[PDB]
Design a binder for this molecule. Structure first.
Ligand SMILES: C/C(=C\COc1ccccc1CN(C)C(=O)c1ccc(-c2ccco2)cc1)CCC(=O)O
Ligand SMILES: C/C(=C\COc1ccccc1CN(C)C(=O)c1ccc(-c2ccco2)cc1)CCC(=O)O
Lengths: 257, 245
């Protein structure tokens, strides 16, 4: 029990050192000024300077998809650094590390997106912008449809009221996932993931003494996130298929390969 | 440096028999070179000579695990590792340290036994029946070569601390932390060997090779222990040693 506490603490310190944006900072921004991007005009103002090199200009729905890609890429690089500070992650085979990152980053990105989202939209640009969910729904298919299911997931996730300390362990559990295809040392990964999930159960009784069923609720969100990413990867295949003049960042190319 | 002195202090606190004590005896102990001497000299109930010596080996290695366990508490930052990692380090390392320290009580002809009091010849131990004699002799071969390095206790105190702090063990949770502790130990050791053996040359990387030789010696050891566990159904194993195996 005492090793699990200190393992949780190590994981929470890796999280605080590696993510630019915590849930604690995001909620203080969201509740109080970010500049509101809610239409074409405000988006252009935001690009001039009140908020912020993306493959040469074309049309709003595609410009937005490109900003999503720039953000997602930056969060992969934070996740990669976070994982390297997860105790035994850096002593796994190099190919296992890359495999865990390749198949887990999206699950982690859509878990952590909740932190910066409310029912009305989300923070961008390290909290200096706020893009409304109504504006993102206004984009043309297939861009609007690849966006809205994440808000639907996030708002439900937020009703669980996790804090940073809980998320560090939850995101650690997503990444150290013994089920990813092509792993070399499965029992080792499985063992690390079971340590995290034991530490997570113990940390939840401590931090959320009156919640009920919070731990199995979280195992289910991990399942939901897998389904969310399977659906996302299908939509991304459809974009790559039907939107030929839209490119994808090479780091994301490798991931979806 | 102070670090080196502290590890030495702890080694002197934890191991009753030092190379120093052992060297001034080996230069009178009762010679045990056959059945009649063994019996004059004299655990699980008696079985036969060979199994009897095997039990004596077990009682000694058990005691030395206890000592090594207390010793490691003095290695700085060992006590701050996960408890699980502590147990793993002890589990996979105590035999490499026990075979390293065995060189201290050994010469080409045999070893000291129940304090300085007895000498058991290598001859006799070879005369035990298979697989008991095979279990024994390869430690002697290693120990004679190790002794040609001519370490003293202050050197061995760091060397045993290095052995226990191996980042490579199976199931370690915090490898980089263990590795960083061993690094300070190995840096103290290089520094110590420069100061304690100024005219010996290459002693440091030769010690690093002895660590890899020990790892292999223990692998061959555990393998031998495993067939004894199958084929020598009668003979018992102190359970402290079952858990290690
Ligand atoms: C379209 C891809 C993912 C989908 O991204 C989604 C999906 C649902 C909600 C939020 C995101 C993106 N996100 C985490 C952001 O923080 C974000 C960043 C910037 C903007 C934006 C809008 C106008 C100007 O700036 C909007 C969102 C490809 C990327 C991939 O699959 O890796
Ligand atoms: C056979 C096991 C270990 C290996 O033992 C070895 C192997 C090679 C050299 C020296 C030892 C033992 N040793 C460190 C002693 O100090 C010792 C103690 C007593 C006697 C003895 C002989 C007649 C009466 O008393 C002889 C040796 C199983 C136990 C285990 O695996 O931990």
């Amino acid at each position: 029990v005492a090793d699990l506490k200190a393992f949780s603490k190590h994981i929470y310190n890796a999280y605080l050192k590696n993510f630019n944006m915590t849930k604690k900072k995001a909620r203080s921004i969201l509740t109080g000024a970010p500049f509101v991007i809610h239409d074409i005009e405000t988006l252009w103002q935001a690009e001039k300077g009140l908020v912020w090199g993306l493959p040469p200009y074309k049309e709003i729905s595609v410009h937005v998809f490109y900003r999503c890609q720039c953000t997602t890429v930056e969060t992969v690089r934070e996740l990669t650094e976070f994982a390297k500070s997860i105790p035994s992650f850096s002593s796994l085979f190099l190919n296992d590390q890359v495999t865990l990152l390749k198949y887990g980053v999206h699950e982690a990105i859509f878990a952590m997106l909740a932190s910066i989202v409310n029912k009305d939209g989300l923070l961008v640009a390290n909290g200096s912008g706020f893009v409304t969910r109504e504006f993102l729904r206004s984009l043309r298919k297939p861009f609007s449809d690849i966006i809205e299911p994440k808000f639907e997931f996030a708002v439900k996730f937020n009703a669980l009221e996790l804090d940073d300390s809980d998320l560090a362990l939850f995101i650690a559990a997503i990444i150290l996932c013994g089920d990813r295809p092509g792993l070399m040392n499965v029992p080792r990964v499985e063992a690390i993931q079971d340590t995290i999930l034991r530490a997570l159960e113990f940390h939840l009784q401590a931090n959320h003494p009156d919640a009920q069923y919070l731990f199995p609720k979280l195992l289910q969100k991990m399942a939901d996130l897998r389904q969310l990413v399977t659906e996302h990867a299908q939509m991304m295949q459809r974009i790559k298929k039907t939107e030929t003049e839209t490119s994808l960042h090479p780091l994301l190319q490798e991931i979806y390969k």
